[PDB]
């Protein structure tokens, strides 16, 4: 029994059991898309300047 994947995983993952899953593997990057409606854009003079 060469040690578990809990202790040997690259990027510092955190292997768990009941769903077989890894946690918090610091690798890659998430891109994001924001479809923002036009109602949220407050005008200039309703904010300090």
């Amino acid at each position: 029994k060469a040690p578990s994947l809990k202790f040997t995983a690259p990027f510092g993952c955190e292997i768990y059991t009941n769903p077989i899953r890894a946690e918090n593997c610091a690798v890659g990057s998430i891109p994001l898309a924001f479809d923002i409606p036009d109602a949220l854009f407050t005008r200039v003079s309703e904010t300090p300047t």
């Binding site: 005008r43 200039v44 003079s45 300047t49």
Partner: protein
Amino acid sequence: LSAAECTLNECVYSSDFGGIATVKYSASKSGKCAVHVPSGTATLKEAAV
């Protein structure tokens, strides 16, 4: 008036009255009178302030 200065707070060339100009003046008498733009550059909302 005497020594009046005009700055543009909001400026958006929208179809409605989408621009705010705050005229910083210094008046000899305190009384209402009429503002106007001679050109077709801007169309003012109110006739007097």
